[PDB]
């Protein structure tokens, strides 16, 4: 091989969703090699160490006192509140299921059970 | 050593390794009532080198060790590879026994009352043999092992015998203290000048 001339393409990894941005459950937030960012509140981590939203909400980047020397990406459930959330204050959950008003639907639901 | 903060690069920098060496060293505390030198543990390692060829030799060595001490040894495997000597990793070679408490005391007594005396030309342990944090070591040839009670009683049973190293760990802060302590237990240090 007199000349070299081989190389791979860029991988397009990096942040795909920025502080303040509204994610939806599933949306990929960060692509990375290794964990330069760690999953925080309401955030999952896939096989690539890709961070993604577990819930609808607002993306925030933070430093967690419990974990010094680690950067966190998380989803705050609503905009107003900060994300490295007070340790002892009750955890803000979503619930986020709707109730079957339509009577037939409700009946069906009632009927259906595990196998 | 911590970094002088005369530049901004020092800020989140790991400290400088010790002026003398790579490794960090302990503080020498003064010898008071609370921390007098004492015998901590005796480790015996018999690395039979001829066991590179014959693996039964290792077993025999281990048995010998057991006989000498009265507590189960543990096998010593060859941790490295080297062509010059016929050495390949993953090869059982010799036995290592950790002696503590009463057992270790017993062993030491046996060494001092019987063996070290009986060995023909022994001029005592070398004074340079200090670990430097209060550890002392010395060898025994393949011949001297015959002088132990458990072996001497049946020479018919032990055709091959294997030499060994003996390491003695002490609660001593420094080597000289340790050697003084050892002398108390009848260890001749006439081997050299410190």
């Amino acid at each position: 091989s007199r000349t070299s001339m081989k190389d791979s393409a860029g991988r397009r990894l990096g942040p795909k969703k920025y502080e303040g941005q509204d994610v939806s459950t599933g949306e990929i937030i960060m692509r990375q090699r290794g964990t330069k960012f760690y999953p925080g509140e309401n955030v999952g981590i896939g096989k690539d160490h890709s961070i993604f939203a577990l819930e609808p909400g607002v993306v925030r980047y933070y430093l967690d006192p419990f974990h010094p020397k680690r950067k966190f990406i998380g989803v705050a459930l609503r905009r107003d509140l900060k994300l490295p959330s007070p340790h002892f204050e009750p955890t803000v959950r979503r619930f986020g299921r709707f109730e079957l008003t339509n009577k037939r639907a409700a009946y069906k639901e009632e009927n259906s059970i595990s196998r | 050593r911590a970094w002088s903060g005369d530049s901004p690069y020092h800020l989140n920098r790991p400290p400088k390794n010790p002026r003398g060496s790579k490794a960090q060293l302990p503080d020498i505390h003064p010898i008071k009532w609370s921390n007098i030198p004492g015998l901590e543990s005796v480790v015996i390692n018999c690395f039979v080198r001829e066991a590179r060829e014959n693996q039964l030799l290792a077993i025999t060595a281990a048995l010998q060790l057991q006989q000498i001490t009265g507590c189960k040894p543990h096998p010593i495997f060859s941790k490295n590879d080297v062509p010059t000597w016929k050495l390949r990793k993953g090869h059982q070679m010799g036995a290592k026994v950790e002696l503590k408490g009463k057992e270790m005391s017993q062993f030491l007594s046996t060494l001092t009352e019987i063996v070290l005396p009986r060995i023909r030309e022994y001029k005592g342990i070398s004074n340079q043999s200090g670990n430097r944090f209060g550890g002392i070591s010395f060898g025994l040839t393949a011949e001297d092992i015959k002088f132990f009670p458990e072996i001497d009683a049946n020479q018919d049973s032990w055709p091959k015998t294997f030499g060994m190293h003996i390491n003695i760990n002490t609660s001593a802060q420094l080597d000289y203290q340790a050697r003084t302590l050892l002398s108390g237990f009848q260890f001749p240090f006439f081997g050299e000048e410190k």
Binding site: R2, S4, L63, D64, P65, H67, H87 | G5, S7, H10
Partner: protein
């Protein structure tokens, strides 16, 4: 013994790069930390090749040899390998073969300095002038009490500078990471981490 031929293990080719024009006012390698009299670059930064350096060195040496307890030390080393294509060959077909070693020299850097109780400063100056002739820039003689070249028409004294303690500064105006660390160190967090 080998400032002109540094022994890197992996002999690897190197992109041409550019000679730094130290804009933040470096002052690094611009003072004479040993020796009495020195030889500094006066002009724009230049790439000095090993051969040139050697020739300069040899020129200087003849002046020093006579002196009792007189010696010359070389401040810069030719660390950058240069590959040159054969003249006859055309463009393409990759990079050329390793030719020689060079060193990028910023504007105010000291190439050499000397000392030797016996030596008269005039002689030293002369020597340095002679050395200069072998090198591809314009050079200036420096003494132990001559102010440092920062730019190419600008000087400074290193003794007049802000002696800061940077830890203190950091504490005063802290980064986020540091703050986080401090918080972590604080009692409750330490207690409740449960690792």
């Amino acid at each position: 013994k080998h400032e002109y031929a540094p022994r890197f293990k992996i002999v690897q080719k190197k992109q041409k790069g550019r000679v730094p024009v130290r804009t933040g006012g470096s002052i690094k390698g611009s003072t004479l930390q040993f020796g009495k009299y020195g030889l500094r670059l006066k002009s724009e930064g230049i790439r000095i090749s090993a051969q040139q350096l050697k020739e300069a060195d040899n020129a200087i040496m003849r002046y020093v040899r006579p002196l009792n307890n007189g010696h010359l030390w070389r401040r810069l080393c030719t660390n950058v390998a240069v590959c040159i294509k054969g003249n006859e060959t055309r463009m393409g077909k990759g990079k050329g073969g390793f030719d020689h070693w060079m060193v990028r020299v910023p504007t105010g850097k000291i190439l050499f300095e000397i000392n030797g109780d016996d030596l008269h400063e005039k002689v030293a100056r002369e020597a340095f002038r002679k050395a200069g002739t072998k090198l591809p820039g314009v050079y200036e003689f420096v003494s132990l009490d001559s102010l440092v070249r920062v730019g190419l028409h600008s000087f400074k004294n290193p003794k007049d500078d802000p002696v800061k303690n940077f830890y203190d500064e950091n504490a005063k105006k802290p980064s986020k990471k540091y703050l986080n660390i401090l918080k972590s160190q604080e009692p409750q967090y330490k207690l409740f981490r449960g690792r």
